[PDB]
Assembly symmetry: C5
Homo-oligomer: 103 residues x 5
């Protein structure tokens, strides 16, 4: 069992860590058909999404997806600092796998 | 996969972006039958709605619809400035498809 | 589609708007069997309830009932000003159908 | 239908109102098997629980129990003043049936 | 029925109370498959996790597992002081069984 985001990220193919250590610059969410997703960006231009739930996701993940979005929304609204993000490299924008926050 | 609300909005017919850059002025929610919805207005400005889950909606959208109303509620409470709204303009008041927030 | 709580309220029988323009004075919720409800009051003594889900309700109203209780709790805890309440006046306390909040 | 926690509490057997008029001193939560409950205490030493969801709860009560825990947690965090608690006295600690917050 | 986290913890094998009396230093959440979990740290380097729901858990725990993660997130954001953590000490990182907050 990983003890941190970096180690966890490393257990998957085409994932990479992005160290941001900054609050989220912008938060966007959509209910539009086939575009029920969330996108976040940081003042430096970095952009990430929380993918539309799909077949690429297993059942156990669906609830975690909803949670990530609750997390991103609140982190944004509170300006919580985002330390790191684990993301899949094979999606544009890069899809969020995990997030770490620290003061 | 779009990287911002504008591009996302451009992916649908009958849509448009409303640039607000202002916090929500009022929030109204109804549990009344066939009128389960949320309605927001902007100071001296427009009124927007999150449509009642109708036949027009695909199953994937339901949760996103619930999420959008929660988002509108908290942005209102917290007085978070809304950047832009992507709405369907073949509906009245215009119906919210997506929302971006940035300071 | 109604653009405000007043117009929405008038779309049903046995309803009426109560203008409060004030914060919720007290918030009460119960988990007791057959009394899973919330009751709020205002400084002026006005008392309102969020009815226990029942046969008078249609399925699409179930989630809305839960959302309204979430709304009242946070509104209460943040002392959000409640503008108006559309209620059904054929129940005691008057049963909330909708709520509007404005600064 | 009752109009306050006191009247609501009286509709059931083995219950009693505790008048606290104080913020919560401690909040405890457990995910341990057969002990998925929550415990709160007030500076005067009073201790109350939200029972593990069980056979003694009708279905309609299930969501309400979860709601009650959310309430206590946010009430704790906001130092919200708890006016009264309606509890079942045939349990130790006494089990929360309802809660009223004011002043 | 236990009246505090310590007595509760003592009801199980392989558990222990960690007394922190401190805010959570970092919060990490993952939606990655088979790694849908949360991990927190304290400035003293202490690491804990909320386990991925697994075979070791009974159904009654799934709900408490989600709420626990909800709890860890709001506490971190509010910088609320965590009093104690009841954990199973036969896992690395130590798995959270319960949490208490006071002061
Ligand atoms: O979202 N889509 O994929 C999609 C595809 C095709 C049409 C379409 O518009 C229709 O449905 C939306 C909600 O989806 C709104 O209610 C519109 O006002 C309605 O006319 C939407
Ligand atoms: O919401 N509707 O579509 C609708 C249609 C017809 C009647 C109606 O009122 C009835 O149900 C509501 C709860 O819905 C309240 O319990 C009222 O006190 C009850 O009289 C509501
Ligand atoms: O809620 N009710 O409708 C209801 C009806 C009859 C008895 C009753 O009490 C029983 O169940 C509650 C939870 O409901 C607590 O566990 C009590 O300690 C137990 O005695 C509750
Ligand atoms: O919670 N219980 O009732 C219970 C009963 C018996 C054993 C037990 O511990 C086992 O499961 C938990 C999750 O429950 C943790 O994963 C422990 O590390 C694992 O060994 C837990
Ligand atoms: O999460 N996993 O356990 C897991 C296992 C194997 C592949 C895998 O990646 C695939 O699915 C994820 C969503 O999970 C993303 O959509 C990736 O971009 C896609 O390639 C993910």
């Amino acid at each position: 069992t990983p003890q941190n985001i970096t180690d966890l990220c490393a257990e998957y193919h085409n994932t990479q860590i992005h160290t941001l250590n900054d609050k989220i610059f912008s938060y966007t969410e959509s209910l539009a058909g086939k575009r029920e997703m969330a996108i976040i960006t940081f003042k430096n231009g970095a952009t990430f999404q929380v993918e539309v739930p799909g077949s690429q996701h297993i059942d156990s993940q669906k609830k975690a997806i909803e949670r990530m979005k609750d997390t991103l929304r609140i982190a944004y609204l509170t300006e919580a600092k985002v330390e790191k993000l684990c993301v899949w490299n094979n999606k544009t924008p890069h899809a969020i796998a995990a997030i770490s926050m620290a003061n």
